[PDB]
Design a binder for this molecule. Structure first.
Ligand SMILES: [Cl-]
Length: 164
């Protein structure tokens, strides 16, 4: 298991434009295209991302290319964020994957507002951190995914993904 396999499980793989859990146009392995309700706007974002006129369909190779870029972007975002970087640096590699997963899903700003959870994570108060993380819109809207990510933070193991 690693961050790529982890996010592949959590996000799935779809080669045609679809709507994510929030109703936003998305493609590949959870590549958000736009929050706009316009399909044409989403197709435009897709073409710009891929570098060709796609009309809403991409290949597996293309989906994986965007995925790699997105994972890179999430890590880079954590490292450039004053609130997130110290907490991330404080973590072991397994829990770092859980951190990247969160940022991948909700963005740097969204995660950076988990102030109390972040403190508990840096303190290595794993059970307390886990309890706090679940007190969120995030957990309520995507409980099964959040539960996996939280278990990863709580245990520092891949137990929540090992079977799937
Ligand atoms: Cl389409």
């Amino acid at each position: 298991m690693n961050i790529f396999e982890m996010l592949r499980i959590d996000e799935g793989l779809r080669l045609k434009i679809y709507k994510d859990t929030e109703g936003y146009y998305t493609i590949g392995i959870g590549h958000l295209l736009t929050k706009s309700p316009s399909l044409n706007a989403a197709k435009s974002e897709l073409d710009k991302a891929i570098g060709r006129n796609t009309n809403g369909v991409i290949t597996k190779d293309e989906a994986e290319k965007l995925f790699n870029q997105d994972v890179d972007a999430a890590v880079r975002g954590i490292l450039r964020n004053a609130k997130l970087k110290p907490v991330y640096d404080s973590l072991d590699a397994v829990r770092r994957a859980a951190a990247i997963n969160m940022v991948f899903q909700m963005g740097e700003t969204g995660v950076a507002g988990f102030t109390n959870s972040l403190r508990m994570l840096q303190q290595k108060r794993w059970d307390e951190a886990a309890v706090n993380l679940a007190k969120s819109r995030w957990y309520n809207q995507t409980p099964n995914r959040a539960k996996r990510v939280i278990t990863t933070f709580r245990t520092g193991t891949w137990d929540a993904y090992k079977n799937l």
